[PDB]
C-alpha cells in the first residue's frame, strides 16, 4: 500500500529468461571513470553478495510534461506521465541518454549513462503504467513493472539481449522495469543503525578498530583482520560496510539478530568465518551466505531468535548508531568476538568479559573517497600488470590495457583533487580546503602515490610515443603522452597542499631529478619539484650539487623559462630561511 515519494532510494530491476533460466538484473553504474551503465545480477545472493551501492538510485524531483517543457523554456508522490530525475546514490551523478551508440546492431539506439549537466531533456525520464489495468494519472506503482521513456530521445529503457551479458540500451522496444523502495528517507531516524551503511567498529576503551594490513604487504597478508589503535582509526582501511541479505528495503534499520554481510570498502572483499581459522576476507565470487552472514546481539549470551524474518519499511529502530553496545555472532557456528597496538581478533564462543562495540558514522566524503581509492587501485593494478606483461613478454596479444578508461579515470580524479577557487566565500573555501586535505591524507595512508609512481615508471620504460605505439597499438601510443601528463598532474595534486605528503615524497625526489631530462615529462617533473620544495623544508634539505647542476643543465638545454628560475628561488629561500650553501 506504500507509495513512492520524492527523495527516496529506488532500484530498477528487470527479469530475464536466458536459456530458460530466470535471472534478476538491476541497473547499476560505476560513475567514476565509467559513464556507461550496465546490469548487475541481483539474483543468487546466497552465492555472491550483490553490490547495491552502485545500483541504488534516488528520485530527486518529478515534473509533468508541460511543467518540464515550461521549465526548459525558462516528499511528493509520483504520477504517471511525469518526468523523473534519477540520481546515482554513490556517484551523485545523474542518469541520462548518452548520444554515443555502443552497439552497432541496435540501430537508432543510444546508450544510457550519467551526466552532470542536468539541464537536458535526456536527463529526465517519464514513467508510464506498463500494466494495462492501471491508467495514466494514477498514483505511482510500487514493487511492480512500469515503463521508462526518455523525454528527448523518445526511446524506452530497452534491455538489449546480450549473449555474454545482458546490457541496457535506450531503444524503441518495451522493457518491464520493477522498482524497489530501499529507503523512504523521511522515516529514517538519525543516531540509529541503518542498513547499507559504512561505519567503524571500535571498542569501548581499547578503541582498536577492526583493521587489516595496508598495501605494505600483499592482499593475502591483508586478508587477516586484527585490532590496531592510534591514528589507524581515521585511516580509510578501518571502514566496514553492512549489506542486508534481503534486496528490497535494504535501507531499513538494522534489528538485533538480523543477518548481514560485512565488506571492506578499501579492498572490496567480504569478511567470513571458517571454523578452522579466524575471520578472513575473500572476494564476492566465493562469499557464501553461510560463511559471510553475521548478526549483532545485545548480550554476550545466546538467546533464541524469535524476531520477525522480514519487516517491511524502515521498521523498528532497535540498534542505535551512537556507540550502541553489540556483539557479532556468526549464524552458522554461533561463536562470539574475543580479544587478547596489534591485537588478534580471535573468534571463540566464550568471548570475553569486555566485548562491547561502538559504531562510528565516519563521513560520507570519507566513504566515497574510500570507494574511489578502491576503484582506482584496482584499475591501476590491472593496467600495470597488463603493461608489464606486454613489456616483458609477447605471449598473449590480448592485454587488459583500458587506455580510454584510465584516461577518463585520471581526468575525473584530477577534477576531484582540483583546488578550490579563491573567489568563493571564506567559510566555503575553508571547508573545501579541509576536504581536499582529508582526501590527500586518505590517499597517502592508502599508498596511492607509490602506485602512481610505479605506473609512471612503467610508462617511462618506453622510449618514445611512436615506440610505445608500435608496441601496443596506435591509439595507446597516441594517448601515451596524455596519460603521462595526467599522471604527473595527479601526483602534483596529491602532494601539493600539505606537508606530510611532501615529506614522504622527499625520499622519491631523487627519481624526479634522475628522469628530469626526458624532454616529454619535464614540465610535470618541474611542477612536482616546485610544489614539493615550496612546502617541505626537509625535501629541500636533501637537494645536492648534482641535482642543482642538473636543473641548470635543464634550463640550458630546454631554453629560457621562468619556471626553472622559480624553482631556483625556492631552493635559495624557503619559509624565510636562507640556505647559504
Amino acid at each position: 500500500i506504500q507509495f513512492l515519494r520524492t527523495d527516496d532510494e529506488v532500484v530498477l530491476q528487470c527479469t530475464a529468461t536466458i536459456h530458460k533460466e530466470q535471472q534478476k538484473l538491476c541497473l547499476a553504474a560505476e560513475g567514476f571513470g565509467n559513464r556507461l551503465c550496465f546490469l548487475e545480477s541481483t539474483s543468487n545472493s546466497k552465492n555472491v553478495p550483490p553490490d547495491l551501492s552502485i545500483c541504488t538510485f534516488v528520485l530527486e524531483q518529478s515534473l509533468s510534461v508541460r511543467a518540464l517543457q515550461e521549465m526548459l523554456a525558462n516528499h511528493r508522490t509520483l504520477l504517471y506521465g511525469h518526468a523523473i530525475l534519477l540520481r546515482h546514490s554513490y556517484s551523485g551523478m545523474y542518469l541520462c541518454c548518452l548520444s554515443t551508440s555502443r552497439s552497432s546492431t541496435d540501430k537508432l539506439a543510444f546508450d544510457v549513462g550519467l551526466q552532470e549537466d542536468t539541464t537536458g531533456e535526456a536527463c529526465w525520464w517519464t514513467i508510464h503504467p506498463a500494466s494495462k489495468q492501471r491508467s495514466e494519472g494514477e498514483k505511482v506503482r510500487v514493487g511492480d513493472d512500469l515503463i521508462l521513456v526518455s523525454v528527448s530521445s523518445e526511446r524506452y529503457l530497452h534491455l538489449s539481449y546480450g549473449n555474454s551479458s545482458w546490457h541496457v540500451d535506450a531503444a524503441f522496444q518495451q522493457t518491464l522495469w520493477s522498482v524497489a523502495p530501499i529507503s523512504s528517507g523521511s522515516e529514517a531516524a538519525q543516531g540509529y543503525l541503518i542498513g547499507g551503511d559504512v561505519l567503524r567498529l571500535l571498542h569501548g576503551h581499547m578503541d582498536e578498530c577492526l583493521t587489516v594490513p595496508s598495501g605494505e604487504h600483499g592482499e593475502e597478508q591483508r586478508r587477516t583482520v586484527h585490532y590496531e589503535g592510534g591514528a589507524v582509526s581515521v585511516h580509510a582501511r578501518s571502514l566496514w560496510r553492512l549489506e542486508t541479505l534481503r534486496v528490497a528495503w535494504s535501507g531499513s534499520h538494522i534489528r538485533w539478530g538480523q543477518p548481514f554481510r560485512l565488506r571492506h570498502v578499501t579492498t572490496g572483499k567480504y569478511l567470513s568465518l571458517m571454523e578452522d581459522k579466524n575471520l578472513l576476507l575473500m572476494d564476492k565470487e566465493k562469499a557464501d551466505v553461510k560463511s559471510t552472514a553475521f548478526a549483532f546481539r545485545s548480550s554476550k549470551e545466546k538467546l533464541d531468535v524469535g524476531v520477525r524474518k522480514e519487516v517491511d519499511g524502515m521498521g523498528t529502530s532497535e540498534i542505535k548508531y551512537g556507540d550502541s553496545i553489540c556483539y557479532i555472532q556468526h549464524v552458522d557456528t554461533g561463536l562470539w568476538l574475543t580479544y587478547q597496538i596489534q591485537r588478534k581478533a580471535i573468534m571463540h564462543h566464550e568471548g570475553h568479559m569486555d566485548d562491547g562495540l561502538n559504531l562510528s558514522r565516519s563521513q560520507h566524503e570519507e566513504s566515497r573517497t574510500a570507494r574511489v581509492i578502491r576503484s582506482t587501485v584496482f584499475l591501476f593494478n590491472r593496467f600495470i600488470r597488463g603493461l608489464d606483461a606486454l613489456s616483458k613478454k609477447v605471449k598473449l596479444p590480448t592485454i587488459d590495457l583500458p587506455i580510454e578508461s584510465v584516461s577518463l579515470s585520471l581526468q575525473d580524479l584530477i577534477g576531484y583533487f582540483h583546488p578550490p577557487d579563491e573567489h568563493l566565500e571564506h567559510e566555503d573555501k575553508q571547508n573545501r580546503l579541509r576536504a581536499l586535505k582529508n582526501r590527500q591524507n586518505l590517499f597517502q595512508e592508502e599508498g596511492m602515490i607509490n602506485l602512481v609512481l610505479e605506473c609512471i615508471d612503467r610508462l617511462h620504460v618506453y622510449s618514445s610515443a611512436a615506440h610505445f605505439a608500435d608496441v601496443a597499438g596506435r591509439e595507446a601510443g597516441e594517448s601515451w603522452k596524455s596519460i603521462l601528463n595526467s599522471l604527473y598532474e595527479l601526483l602534483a595534486a596529491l602532494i601539493r597542499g600539505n606537508r606530510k605528503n611532501c615529506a614522504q615524497f622527499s625520499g622519491s625526489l631523487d627519481w624526479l631529478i634522475s628522469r628530469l631530462e626526458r624532454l616529454e615529462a619535464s614540465s610535470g617533473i618541474l611542477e612536482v619539484l616546485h610544489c614539493v620544495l615550496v612546502e617541505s623544508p626537509e625535501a629541500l634539505n636533501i637537494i645536492k650539487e648534482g641535482h642543482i647542476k642538473s636543473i641548470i643543465s635543464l634550463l640550458d638545454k630546454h631554453g629560457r623559462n621562468h619556471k626553472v628560475l622559480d624553482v631556483l628561488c625556492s631552493l635559495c629561500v624557503c619559509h624565510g630561511v636562507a640556505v647559504r650553501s
Binding site: 540501430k107 537508432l108 531533456e121 528527448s152 530521445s153 523518445e154
Partner: protein, 39 residues
C-alpha cells in the same frame, strides 16, 4: 520546434547520408527499346 529537431535526428540516424549518395549515383541503362525494369 524541438520536436522537429528530434524527428530530423531520428531520420538522420535512420538513413545514412552515404547510402543516399550511393543510391543517387546508381545510374540507368540507356536503351532498340529497353523494358522499364530496373532502377
Amino acid at each position: 520546434k524541438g520536436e522537429a529537431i528530434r524527428i530530423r535526428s531520428i531520420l538522420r540516424s535512420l538513413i545514412p547520408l552515404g547510402d543516399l549518395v550511393g543510391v543517387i549515383s546508381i545510374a540507368f541503362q540507356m536503351p532498340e527499346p529497353d523494358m522499364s525494369a530496373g532502377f
